[PDB]
Design an enzyme around this catalytic site. Structure first.
Site, PDB file in Angstrom:
ATOM      1  N   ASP B  25      33.636  34.979  44.192  1.00  8.54           N
ATOM      2  CA  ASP B  25      33.902  34.917  42.764  1.00  8.54           C
ATOM      3  C   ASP B  25      33.685  33.520  42.168  1.00  8.54           C
ATOM      4  O   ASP B  25      34.565  32.645  42.230  1.00  8.54           O
ATOM      5  CB  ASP B  25      35.330  35.396  42.487  1.00  8.54           C
ATOM      6  N   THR B  26      32.519  33.342  41.558  1.00  9.80           N
ATOM      7  CA  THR B  26      32.160  32.085  40.906  1.00  9.80           C
ATOM      8  C   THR B  26      33.005  31.780  39.666  1.00  9.80           C
ATOM      9  O   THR B  26      33.046  30.635  39.221  1.00  9.80           O
ATOM     10  CB  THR B  26      30.675  32.076  40.506  1.00  9.80           C
ATOM     11  N   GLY B  27      33.671  32.796  39.112  1.00  8.69           N
ATOM     12  CA  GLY B  27      34.572  32.608  37.973  1.00  8.69           C
ATOM     13  C   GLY B  27      36.010  32.228  38.306  1.00  8.69           C
ATOM     14  O   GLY B  27      36.819  32.062  37.400  1.00  8.69           O
TER      15      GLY B  27
END
Ligand SMILES: COc1ccc(S(=O)(=O)N(CC(C)C)C[C@@H](O)[C@H](Cc2ccccc2)NC(=O)[C@@H]2CN(c3cccc(C(F)(F)F)c3)C(=O)O2)cc1
EC number: 3.4.23.16
Lengths: 99, 99
Positions: B25-27
């Protein structure tokens, strides 16, 4: 481009001639933007997140240029803590994870 | 490897004797794992997302294997619906976004 993850992957998007910053968010199914006006019909929707569920407005077939790459798709508008670009548009711009 | 985003970027992680599926999850600034009783010291923290905040326990220097890549760092444990591998560990396994 290639984007590393020591900093938040924030990029400039263009939507309705307006420039905003948005987070490239691989953990988000859906693109969700903070309160804004968009033209056309919308449908009330509810979505879940880590803290619970919220009400959003669903706009279909909205053009967004994300870091210079064109997408046209669904944009949810509501009380997200930050503008997020989710997988529905990340796939359109050809974004992948690599390691 | 390269992971497309047509589906959720789930991968197998290992933390001790527990194998789990988790989102790359880059967020997510931080790594957030489902409730589990890890040994050692921790500190309480609040983290916020869609829908509001949840209470988590911050454990430091926890080794975790992600797709057979070694990582060690801060892990936040709390009532999340999904195990989330955040940027603090994504960088350690060489993860980038590309388009
Ligand atoms: C400090 O460290 C942090 C802080 C916040 C997060 S975050 O999880 O809230 N979120 C932050 C972002 C909104 C700015 C990361 C998102 O990638 C988040 C991950 C997530 C996925 C699924 C459940 C809960 C969290 N994604 C989302 O908020 C939305 C929620 N979501 C979803 C889809 C179907 C069902 C559900 C639910 F579980 F709520 F029913 C959630 C989804 O696909 O993306 C993580 C780490």
């Amino acid at each position: 481009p290639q984007i590393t993850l020591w900093k938040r992957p924030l990029v400039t998007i263009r939507i309705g001639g307006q420039l905003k910053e948005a987070l490239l968010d691989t953990g988000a199914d859906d693109t969700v933007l903070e309160e804004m006006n968009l033209p056309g019909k919308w449908k009330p929707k509810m979505i879940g997140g880590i803290g619970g569920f919220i009400k959003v407005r669903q706009y279909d077939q909205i053009p967004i240029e994300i870091c210079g790459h064109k997408a046209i798709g669904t944009v949810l508008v509501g009380p997200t803590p930050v503008n997020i670009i989710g997988r529905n548009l990340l796939t359109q711009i050809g974004c992948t994870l690599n390691f």
